[PDB]
Design a protein around this motif. Structure first.
Motif, mmCIF file in Angstrom:
data_model
loop_
_atom_site.group_PDB
_atom_site.id
_atom_site.type_symbol
_atom_site.label_atom_id
_atom_site.label_comp_id
_atom_site.label_asym_id
_atom_site.label_seq_id
_atom_site.Cartn_x
_atom_site.Cartn_y
_atom_site.Cartn_z
ATOM 1 N N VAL A 10 31.351 42.182 68.345
ATOM 2 C CA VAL A 10 32.550 42.881 67.873
ATOM 3 C C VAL A 10 33.308 41.989 66.894
ATOM 4 N N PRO A 11 33.728 42.510 65.742
ATOM 5 C CA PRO A 11 34.404 41.715 64.692
ATOM 6 C C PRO A 11 35.921 41.631 64.856
ATOM 7 N N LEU A 12 36.361 40.754 65.749
ATOM 8 C CA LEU A 12 37.776 40.644 66.071
ATOM 9 C C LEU A 12 38.494 39.699 65.117
ATOM 10 N N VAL A 13 39.787 39.951 64.937
ATOM 11 C CA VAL A 13 40.652 39.101 64.128
ATOM 12 C C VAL A 13 41.317 38.082 65.042
ATOM 13 N N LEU B 223 39.265 39.611 57.673
ATOM 14 C CA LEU B 223 38.725 40.966 57.633
ATOM 15 C C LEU B 223 37.793 41.148 56.441
#
Ligand code: DGD
Ligand code: CLA
Ligand code: CLA
Ligand code: CLA
Ligand code: PHO
Ligand code: LMG
Ligand code: LMG
Ligand code: LMG
Ligand code: LHG
Ligand code: BCR
Ligand code: BCR
Ligand code: FE2
Lengths: 55, 481, 34, 75, 34, 55, 65, 340, 37, 55, 29, 41, 31, 34, 41
Positions: free
Chosen positions: D56-59, D69
């Protein structure tokens, strides 16, 4: 015991995602809403037949 | 005639008796302040100001006294650790007694003003009925308050003719009361810059003085006078309630998030110190620099002050207690005795495993050991049937550095588990669980208690403002449509 | 005068123009509809 | 003018049969052409994961969120 | 405990028969209008 | 499971615990138990109270 | 009723009551001041929130001592 | 004067009342509703929660939501022009600025609605009780959607504007705070259920004590709005309820004031409880029972069972609920009961 | 000094008394266990 | 709702309904509800169960 | 010992309920 | 086990408001009886 | 023609039809 | 008043029934159908 | 040290009779005010 019953019911049955529980929450929230609004509307429009130092 | 909830409305048009009632309220408040200070002094323990500070003992009023410059006590001790010889009248006991005397005098004045209610001062010569010129009284009182604010800022904070305010370090190790020079720049609005307080008070003084002069001279416009009902005291009440809950929200926010006016050493560490590893990062940096200059790891860790390590403990987290867990923190864990030293977890391959600290949300958190890259290496299994990460299958050892257990190591299985569970929540300390019969449960700071009480009071006073303003606006109809 | 300050003052101007256009619309109608 | 009178008016339906279907078709084409994916930045069914990242591409940062992002949403 | 069962069986049939014969005793006639 | 006030409960934790799972749906009046103590051990009062409340 | 010495001193302060200026008085200045106060408040709030970053103002614990 | 005729036109009688409060009611409320509508349709929660919350990604009405911003961002306002986004609408939507947009605009629309009620009451010349009643929902919204996340780590722990997201919020608060045990919640539920009770019972009592004012079975057509006499027998209803229940109302004003009062005070008490939770000052444990169970493994109540349920839900939910913490729990660590 | 013209009386019905007594007792019942802890 | 669910007609189960092109599952807000339900389920009546299914 | 307090509170509430039914103000027309 | 300060809190919070309300009712009834001429003064 | 009503009604109805068209297209957009 | 009210009511009912039916068909064929 | 039951004994024995006497005085004064016509009913 009531809270335990509710939690176990959620775990074993998924009460929240049942449309009838949704209908019940809607009914209870609407009942409170309509009770409060009806009471406010009726009490707000009350014929002046008392002083200020009397209920 | 009057229902119970309407009983205090007799004092609505008796300027005189109002004063009496406000004086009675003031006397009650001052008496509470004095009596609370006396009780706290009775139950205070000024023995160890390092591991048993004021905030650890549940003191609520003492921090506010020490913030403004009250440090000495008639008992000979000082809150800053040192000893005082012949403190003056302005000690803790002197402040409490002064407040009690003020309460008594206000009580007597309230009695006098209640008995002699019919003063010619509270009369209108043109009409002959009691009346108050609210737009002028407001000018008088605002001018007075502006003068007081300017005086406090320029003389009692800058130290020109005052003790000063409490100023501490960035980590709450060495803090004391000293005069603060004002900061007339952008940094003056930095909440953590103590010079902002002096600058604010001086400027807001010189500002409110001019506002008060304006209100003393200039009369209201007719449109505003009719719109705001500036002839009814209840509009004053509603607006004042508005200002009061605004101020309560602001103060609760600044205490919860911390500011220069709520130092660590007086109210305890904030919630967000623990989330970001503030003190843990500082401790690591100090250890790194002590190793870099060249020293053994044991003596590098032994140079860390006990206060700094005590801040890095979850028992001091304000967002950890319960609502009905009454009493001070010492009732929750016991009085802290001494630091046990920093444990270091190593495995067979000589790595450096770290125990995952529990967050503030959780009340039960599993014991998990991870390496430098955040990969599980060991834990305490809940079901020890097919566990492949147990502390016994993967041999893990501890080596305490810089403390009571400095230089000691343990290779046994149960003791490693015991120390892992202990170190899962901050640093390891020694507590006395018998002086107060400390149970096994955490409790909250004066910080959390103040925030909770004042946020709830502000929330209620918003409703109070709503109701009272509505009653002012609808005065003529408020008896029946 | 950083990027943040410029953006903040520009937002103040955007609020000003929104209030101004609402007021201009109200003035036009209210008058042409006594 | 009451609602029912307007609803039953013929001159109403002569201005509500060239306006409503056109708007509906425009709303259809808004996502049929795939513009909505680019306007709002939502990922297409084949853009959730890439060859490089399989999670999952979390900030994680706040003041560098833009660059983070931009990188995550590379492929 | 057979005695307790006997006493409860009486109480129950007692009240149930009271109900049944009370509603059989021309109840619809019992009413404001006649 | 304890649910009585005299057994270290308060108003909130206290409750009338429902009947045992071994009984299941079976009718369990007082006279079917061999002793009152046993009737209390298997949660007969719950059945009594609930049936009477419904009626 | 009961003229007291103090009352004599403080009489002029409460002497005028209900006096008012006609025609909007100084309301536009009140509007100007209220707006400038709102600007000041949002400035302070956004600085404290770290949503408005200014040179030489770091919202963090500092070493006053 | 220019102000006067503008005020005259604002208070013009038309289909919908505009008023001075409309100036901030209509734009703010419209923007909040539009933000929710666009949020549950196009924007995603992939980069803040690692979820899919939108119709475009395949969620139905029950699962689509406007999710809270990423926890990495703190309590920032997430202004479109702020340092976190710096314009660039797409990244503003991706990091979760739409939640703050909707929340702030909805709060100001709520203020506008209460002001609108005040203004309507003043124009019609009636008492403003309606605004006081509406103060309840305002308190609930402020305490739950604003104060609670403010007391917590960030906006991430505020409830999300969606159907299933609210259910997740309920379960999260139950698991982490034992919210059902809080007495203020008990007051709130008592007030809400009592309000529903009062509404139903008053409706039934009024509808079943109507007077003979017609000849048809349909009793709805036997009423005229410009009527002076009462349509139902207060005396007969009072006697009926005093004979059945034991106590009955004898004052319509008091009856309707009670109907107003119950739900509002229920909501206010619940809001006080939520404000308490915001600081983790929760009514979680009974210390005496926790001890007495710790020193003896035979003591058990429903209370300890609830605690076990809370521990289970917390441990099994934390990993996916808080992806930013990177929680990894091996199978042997997760608490589980027997074979099940 | 003098007889104040603003002095009124205070009243409370028996129904108000019952409501108050019920409220006080129910509040005590609700909060007693939490105070005991 | 309660009566229907007493005979095991539970609420909607939107578990793993969203799938990307490849086939991997994308969680929704319902999956977190399922997670909480699992947490409650594996813990309720800890000693009562002997077999994997709760029938 | 708190069982005594709980029982006293419950019985007192029940007594208050009893007095509000059989000792009420009679409403007259 | 339990806190020994609650006892005072619970008992005082139960008794003092109850006696206050009883006082209000009794004085209301006494004033009402005094207003109407009769055996009560 | 453009009374406040016409306005409010159109400002609520135009996005509604736009969104309904968009949502229908989606029901087909199949992975 | 040319077109009778119930005719436009029926047409609107048909349209809304169609739209809602297209939604369930979708709960079944496409995204979100598993 | 001391008995923890005295607290209740001392405090209740101080407060309850005191409130009883205050009640008696208040109702006496209210009846007296009601008997004499005036602003108080
Ligand atoms: C009644 C009707 C009301 C009508 C409705 C009106 C609706 C308007 C909408 C309100 C908008 C409010 C947004 C405020 C944003 C917020 O708060 O933003 C938060 C910031 C504080 O910032 C936080 O500060 C924290 C503390 O950090 C500090 O400590 C850290 C230590 O590690 C670091 O040192 C860091 O640098 C340092 O700043 C963390 O940094 C957080 O990440 C950061 O978000 O405050 C601020 O902007 C301002 C804080 C001033 C307080 C005023 C807000 C009152 C809130 C009281 C809350 C009390 C707690 C709840 C009690 C229940
Ligand atoms: C909002 C106001 C407020 C707040 C935040 C606190 C906060 C606290 N009080 Mg406190 N207290 C208050 C008002 C308040 N009190 C008042 C008005 C009284 C008078 C009844 C007391 C009487 C009081 C006592 C008697 C005690 C506390 C104690 C405590 C601590 C637990 C905590 C710091 C306890 C403590 O540890 O203090 C030493 C304690 O024993 N308080
Ligand atoms: C500065 C604060 C302040 C002041 C001066 C007043 C003053 C007044 N209010 Mg009031 N009010 C306030 C805040 C305030 N209010 C707030 C915050 C709320 C919201 C909860 C209200 C809600 C409110 C209502 C709903 C009503 C008033 C009324 C009144 C008037 C009569 C008061 C009376 O008879 O009480 C008499 C009170 C008693 C006999 C006993 C009350 C005991 C309380 C419930 C508990 C005991 C408190 C303790 C100590 C409190 C601690 C402190 C920190 C709060 C009076 C002008 C009444 C009015 O105008 O009548 C027309 C009225 O109906 N107020
Ligand atoms: C009256 C209606 C109204 C209200 C109350 C709000 C309120 C709000 N909007 Mg908003 N908005 C509105 C209408 C409204 N909006 C409309 C119609 C649109 C469509 C164009 C938008 C589009 C919009 C966006 C896109 C965003 C907001 C945002 C916000 C929030 C932050 C706004 C902010 O910080 O600027 C405050 C601005 C002011 C206080 C300016 C007021 C006017 C000033 C005082 C005039 C004088 C200034 C003067 C020129 C300066 C002098 C120089 C100076 C140095 C002294 C806030 C809750 C933001 C948000 O919520 O993000 C999460 C956001 O990103 N709004
Ligand atoms: C969830 C329950 C609930 C809902 C949905 C609700 C809804 C409503 N109540 C209103 C009124 C009232 N409700 C009242 C008492 C109560 N209301 C209650 C509970 C509710 N009341 C309860 C329990 C009480 C008892 C105290 C009163 C006394 C009134 C009124 O007088 C008023 C009315 O006239 O009703 C007809 C209406 C005015 C709304 C408004 O401000 O428009 C303006 C629009 C605004 C402010 C924008 C809303 C912004 C919101 C806060 C955020 C956006 C939310 C999304 C749009 C939707 C999200 C949906 C997901 C979460 C699923 C609205 C229909
Ligand atoms: C008016 C000026 C009064 C003044 O300066 O008081 C100055 C006095 C000086 O107070 C002196 O303080 C010393 C330590 O600061 C010792 O305590 C002395 O005992 C005390 O007299 O302080 C106050 O009265 C405070 C006034 C607050 C207003
Ligand atoms: C006149 C009497 C009035 C009668 C009404 C009585 C009301 C009582 C309600 C008070 C409940 C407190 C009882 C706690 C039980 C107990 O014994 O605690 C006992 C604790 C004291 O704690 C004891 O302290 C001792 C000395 O330190 C030892 O440490 C003991 O171990 C420790 O138990 O009392 C309190 O916590 C202080 C009283 C409450 C303090 C004020 C409340 C806290 C501030 C929050 C206010 C915010 C309110 C916002 C509301 C909106
Ligand atoms: C309604 C409230 C009324 C308020 C007024 C209150 C009056 C209180 C006066 C009672 C004083 C008793 C308090 C003793 C202190 C204490 O806590 O004790 C506590 C003791 C109980 O003792 C406790 O018991 C516990 C359980 O057994 C444990 O053993 C504890 O260790 C033990 O302390 O209470 C008493 O002794 C019982 C109360 C008094 C009994 C009646 C009086 C004895 C009979 C003599 C009567 C003759 C009178 C003739 C007069 C002429
Ligand atoms: C650059 C300065 C810009 C503003 C100048 C003052 C304008 C006052 C106009 C209005 C004016 O003075 O005319 C008077 C105006 C009433 O207008 P009428 O048309 O009724 O007046 C008729 C005559 O009596 C006018 O003499 O008063 C108001 O209602 C004031 C309302 C607050 C107005 C606030 C204005 C300031 C807003 C913020 C400005 C930006 C921040 C600075
Ligand atoms: C006469 C005189 C005198 C004396 C005086 C005195 C001695 C005083 C005292 C005083 C005091 C000694 C006071 C006290 C007070 C107190 C108070 C005032 C309190 C209050 C409290 C409260 C009100 C609280 C409440 C609460 C509760 C209870 C619970 C929780 C919540 C709350 C917190 C809210 C002298 C010699 C000087 C001089 C001469 C004259
Ligand atoms: C956010 C934003 C904004 C705004 C926007 C807007 C304002 C929008 C709007 C939008 C809208 C406004 C939309 C809407 C939509 C709607 C819809 C989508 C609907 C649907 C419906 C339906 C689905 C229905 C259903 C039903 C029911 C409910 C009941 C009965 C049955 C039926 C089935 C019929 C702007 C630009 C400023 C920019 C910034 C951001
Ligand atoms: Fe009604």
């Amino acid at each position: 015991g009531t809270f335990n019953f509710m939690l176990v019911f959620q775990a074993e049955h998924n009460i929240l995602m049942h449309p009838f529980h949704m209908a019940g929450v809607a009914g209870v929230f609407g009942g409170s809403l309509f009770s409060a609004m009806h009471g406010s509307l009726v009490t707000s429009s009350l014929i002046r037949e008392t002083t200020e130092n009397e209920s | 005639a009057l229902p119970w909830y309407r009983v205090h409305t007799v004092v609505l048009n008796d300027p005189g008796r109002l004063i009496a009632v406000h004086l009675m309220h003031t006397a009650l408040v001052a008496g509470w302040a004095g009596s609370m200070a006396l009780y706290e002094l009775a139950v205070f323990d000024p023995s160890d100001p390092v591991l048993n500070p004021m905030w650890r003992q549940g003191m609520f009023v003492m921090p506010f006294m020490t913030r403004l410059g009250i440090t000495d006590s008639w008992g000979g001790w000082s809150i800053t650790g040192e000893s005082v010889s012949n403190p003056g009248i302005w000690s803790f006991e002197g402040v409490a007694l002064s407040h009690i005397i003020l309460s008594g005098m206000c009580f007597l004045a309230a009695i006098w003003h209640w008995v002699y209610w019919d003063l010619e001062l509270f009369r209108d010569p043109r009409t002959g009925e009691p009346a108050l010129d609210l737009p002028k009284i407001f000018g008088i009182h605002l001018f007075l308050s502006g003068l007081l604010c300017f005086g406090f800022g320029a003389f009692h904070v800058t130290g020109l003719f005052g003790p000063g305010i409490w100023v501490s370090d960035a980590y709450g190790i060495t803090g004391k009361v000293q005069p603060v020079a004002p900061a007339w720049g952008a940094d003056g609005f930095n909440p953590f810059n103590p010079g902002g307080i002096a600058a604010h008070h001086i400027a807001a003084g010189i500002f409110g003085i001019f506002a008060g002069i304006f209100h003393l001279t200039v009369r209201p416009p007719q449109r505003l006078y009719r719109a705001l009902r500036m002839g009814n005291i209840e509009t004053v009440l509603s607006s004042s309630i508005s200002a009061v809950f605004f101020a309560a929200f602001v103060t609760s926010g600044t205490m919860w998030y911390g500011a220069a006016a709520t130092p660590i050493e007086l109210f305890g560490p904030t919630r967000y110190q623990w989330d970001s590893g503030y003190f843990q990062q500082e401790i690591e940096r100090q250890v790194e620099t002590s190793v870099s200059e060249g020293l053994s790891e044991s003596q590098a860790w032994s140079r860390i002050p006990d206060k700094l390590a005590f801040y890095d403990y979850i028992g001091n987290n304000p967002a950890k207690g319960g609502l009905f867990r009454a009493g001070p923190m010492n009732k929750g864990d016991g009085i802290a005795e001494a630091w046990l030293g920093h444990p270091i977890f190593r495995d067979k391959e000589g790595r450096e495993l770290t125990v995952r600290r529990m967050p503030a949300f959780f009340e039960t958190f599993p014991v998990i050991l991870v390496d430098k890259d955040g990969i599980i290496r060991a834990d305490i299994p809940f079901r020890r049937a097919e566990s492949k990460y147990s502390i016994e299958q993967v041999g893990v050892t501890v080596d305490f550095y810089g403390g009571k257990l400095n230089g000691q190591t343990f290779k046994d299985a149960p003791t490693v588990k015991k120390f892992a569970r202990k170190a899962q929540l901050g640093e390891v300390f020694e507590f006395d669980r018998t002086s107060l019969e400390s149970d096994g449960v955490f409790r909250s700071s004066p910080r959390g208690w103040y925030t909770y009480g004042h946020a709830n009071f502000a929330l209620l006073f918003f409703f109070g403002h709503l109701w009272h303003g509505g009653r002012t606006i609808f005065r003529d109809v408020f008896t029946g449509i | 005068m950083t990027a943040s300050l410029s953006n903040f003052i520009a937002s103040l101007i955007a609020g000003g123009v929104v209030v101004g256009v609402i007021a201009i619309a109200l003035i036009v109608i209210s008058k042409s509809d006594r | 003018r009451p609602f029912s009178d307007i609803i039953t008016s013929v001159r109403y339906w002569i201005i509500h049969s060239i306006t409503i279907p056109s708007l509906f078709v425009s709303g259809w084409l808004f996502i049929s052409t795939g513009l909505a994916y680019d306007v709002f930045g939502t990922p297409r069914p084949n853009e959730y994961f890439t060859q490089d990242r399989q999670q999952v591409p979390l900030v994680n940062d706040r003041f560098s969120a833009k660059q983070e992002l931009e990188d995550l949403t590379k492929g | 405990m057979l005695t307790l069962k006997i006493l409860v069986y009486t109480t129950v049939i007692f009240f149930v028969s009271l109900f049944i014969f009370g509603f059989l005793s021309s109840d619809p006639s019992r009413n404001p209008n006649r | 499971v304890s649910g009585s006030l005299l057994y270290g409960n308060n108003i909130i934790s206290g409750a009338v615990v429902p009947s045992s799972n071994a009984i299941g749906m079976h009718f369990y009046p007082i006279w079917e138990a061999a002793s009152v103590d046993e009737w209390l051990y298997n949660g007969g009062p719950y059945q009594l109270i609930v049936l009477h409340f419904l009626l | 009723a009961l003229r007291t010495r103090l009352g004599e001193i403080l009489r002029p302060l409460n002497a005028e009551y209900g006096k008012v200026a006609p025609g909007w008085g100084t309301t536009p200045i009140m509007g100007i001041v209220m707006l400038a106060f709102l600007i000041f408040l949002v400035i302070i709030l956004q600085i404290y929130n770290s949503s408005l970053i200014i040179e030489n103002v770091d919202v963090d614990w500092a070493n006053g001592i | 004067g220019l102000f006067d005729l503008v005020d005259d036109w604002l208070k013009k009688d038309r289909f919908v009342f505009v008023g001075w409060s409309g100036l901030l009611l209509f734009p703010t409320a419209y923007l909040a509703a539009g933000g929710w509508m666009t949020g549950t349709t196009f924007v995603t929660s992939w980069y803040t929660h690692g979820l899919a919350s939108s119709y475009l990604e395949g969620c139905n009405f029950l699962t689509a939501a406007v999710s809270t911003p990423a926890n990495s961002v703190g309590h920032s306002l997430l202004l479109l022009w702020g340092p976190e986004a710096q314009g660039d609408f797409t990244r503003w939507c991706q990091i979760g600025g739409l939640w703050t947009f909707v929340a702030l605009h909805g709060a100001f629309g709520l203020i506008g609605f209460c002001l609108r009620q005040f203004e309507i009451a003043r124009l019609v010349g009636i008492r403003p009780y309606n605004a006081i009643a509406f103060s309840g929902p305002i308190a609930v919204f402020v305490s739950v959607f604003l104060l609670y996340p403010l007391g917590q780590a960030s906006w991430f722990f505020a409830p999300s504007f969606g159907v299933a997201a609210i259910f997740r919020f309920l379960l999260f608060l139950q698991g982490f705070h034992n919210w059902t045990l809080n007495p203020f919640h008990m007051m709130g539920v008592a007030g809400i259920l009592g309000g529903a009770l009062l509404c139903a019972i008053h409706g039934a009592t009024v509808e079943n004590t109507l007077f003979e004012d017609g000849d048809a079975a349909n009793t709805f057509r036997a009423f005229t709005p410009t009527q002076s006499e009462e349509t139902y027998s207060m005396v007969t209803a009072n006697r009926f309820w005093s004979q059945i229940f034991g106590v009955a109302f004898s004052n319509k004003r008091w009856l309707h004031f009670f109907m107003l009062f119950v739900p509002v005070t229920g909501l206010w008490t619940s809001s006080i409880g939520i404000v308490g939770l915001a600081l983790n000052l929760r009514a979680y444990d009974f210390v005496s029972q926790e001890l007495r169970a710790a020193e003896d493994p035979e003591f058990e109540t429903f209370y300890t069972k609830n605690h076990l349920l809370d521990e289970g839900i917390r441990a099994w939910m934390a990993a996916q609920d808080q992806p930013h913490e990177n929680f990894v729990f091996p199978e042997e660590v997760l608490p589980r009961g027997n074979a099940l | 000094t003098g007889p104040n013209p603003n002095k009124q009386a205070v009243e409370l019905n028996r129904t108000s008394l019952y409501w108050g007594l019920l409220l006080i007792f129910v509040l005590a019942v609700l909060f007693s266990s939490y105070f005991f802890n | 709702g309660i009566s229907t669910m007493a005979f095991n007609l539970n609420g909607f189960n939107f578990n793993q309904s969203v799938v990307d092109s490849q086939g991997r599952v994308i969680n929704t807000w319902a999956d977190i509800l399922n997670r909480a339900n699992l947490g409650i389920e594996v813990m309720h009546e800890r000693n009562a169960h002997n077999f994997p299914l709760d029938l | 010992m708190e069982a005594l307090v709980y029982t006293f509170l419950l019985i007192g509430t029940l007594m208050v309920i009893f007095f509000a039914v059989f000792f009420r103000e009679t409403p007259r027309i | 086990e339990v806190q020994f300060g609650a006892y005072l809190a619970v008992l005082l919070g139960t008794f003092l408001p109850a006696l206050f309300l009883v006082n209000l009712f009794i004085q209301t009834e006494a004033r009402k009886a005094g207003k109407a001429g009769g055996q009560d003064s | 023609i453009f009374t406040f009503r016409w306005l409010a009604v159109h400002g609520l109805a135009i996005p509604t039809v736009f969104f309904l068209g968009g949502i229908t297209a989606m029901q087909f957009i199949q992975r | 008043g040319r077109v009778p009210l119930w005719l436009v009511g029926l047409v609107g009912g048909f349209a809304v029934i169609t739209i809602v039916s297209l939604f369930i068909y979708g709960s079944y064929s496409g995204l979100g159908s598993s």
